[PDB]
Design a protein around this motif. Structure first.
Motif, mmCIF file in Angstrom:
data_model
loop_
_atom_site.group_PDB
_atom_site.id
_atom_site.type_symbol
_atom_site.label_atom_id
_atom_site.label_comp_id
_atom_site.label_asym_id
_atom_site.label_seq_id
_atom_site.Cartn_x
_atom_site.Cartn_y
_atom_site.Cartn_z
ATOM 1 N N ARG A 18 167.735 65.765 18.944
ATOM 2 C CA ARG A 18 168.383 66.235 20.070
ATOM 3 C C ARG A 18 167.695 67.750 20.203
ATOM 4 O O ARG A 18 167.864 68.311 21.031
ATOM 5 C CB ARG A 18 169.789 66.295 19.958
ATOM 6 N N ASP A 39 169.278 68.576 25.008
ATOM 7 C CA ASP A 39 169.929 68.192 25.904
ATOM 8 C C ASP A 39 170.524 69.187 27.036
ATOM 9 O O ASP A 39 170.932 69.008 27.909
ATOM 10 C CB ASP A 39 171.107 67.639 25.194
ATOM 11 N N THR A 40 169.862 70.469 26.745
ATOM 12 C CA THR A 40 170.223 71.300 27.697
ATOM 13 C C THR A 40 169.249 71.440 28.725
ATOM 14 O O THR A 40 169.833 72.262 29.890
ATOM 15 C CB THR A 40 170.523 72.834 27.302
ATOM 16 N N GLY A 43 167.118 65.842 31.110
ATOM 17 C CA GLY A 43 168.008 64.635 31.475
ATOM 18 C C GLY A 43 167.170 63.379 31.369
ATOM 19 O O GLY A 43 165.905 63.160 31.414
ATOM 20 N N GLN A 54 170.006 67.466 32.215
ATOM 21 C CA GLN A 54 170.608 67.424 30.890
ATOM 22 C C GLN A 54 171.007 66.112 30.287
ATOM 23 O O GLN A 54 171.244 65.180 31.004
ATOM 24 C CB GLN A 54 172.112 68.478 31.243
ATOM 25 N N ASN A 55 171.382 66.337 28.831
ATOM 26 C CA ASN A 55 171.955 65.293 28.340
ATOM 27 C C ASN A 55 171.223 63.836 28.299
ATOM 28 O O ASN A 55 171.820 62.875 28.060
ATOM 29 C CB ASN A 55 173.305 64.979 28.724
ATOM 30 N N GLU A 58 172.078 60.970 25.655
ATOM 31 C CA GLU A 58 173.250 60.133 25.575
ATOM 32 C C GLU A 58 172.740 58.558 26.072
ATOM 33 O O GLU A 58 173.641 57.531 25.872
ATOM 34 C CB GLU A 58 174.285 60.756 26.497
#
Length: 108
Positions: A18, A39-40, A43, A54-55, A58
């Motif tokens: 990450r 993650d900031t 995406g 972002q993210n 996940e």
């Protein structure tokens, strides 16, 4: 611009793929260890990497990084990204959009 990789060394991922962590030369010429939470700034947009999203982690599997991949020695992050329909795709993104500003990993 300039890729962070042009003035940094020893880059790796950490925190489960990450976080980018590198040693970045600053304006005094000294090495400064810097982290950037990917993650900031990255995406997963329907199965593709998205700078400014972002993210991504996940909805990613099998995150892999090679700081000096290929003949041109570029910082390539790879993952399998799920699309909206549930299918996973092998994808890659060159992290050279991240800059080293005075010893700090940044994205603009």
């Amino acid at each position: 611009h300039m890729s962070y990789a042009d003035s940094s060394r020893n880059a790796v991922l950490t925190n489960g793929g990450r976080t980018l962590r590198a040693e970045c030369r600053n304006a005094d010429g000294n090495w400064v260890t810097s982290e950037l939470d990917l993650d900031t700034i990255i995406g997963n947009n329907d199965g593709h990497f998205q700078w400014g999203g972002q993210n991504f982690t996940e909805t990613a599997e099998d995150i892999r990084f090679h700081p000096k991949e290929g003949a041109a020695e570029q910082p390539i992050l790879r993952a399998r990204l799920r699309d909206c329909n549930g299918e996973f795709h092998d994808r890659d993104v060159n992290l050279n959009r991240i800059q080293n500003v005075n010893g700090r990993l940044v994205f603009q």
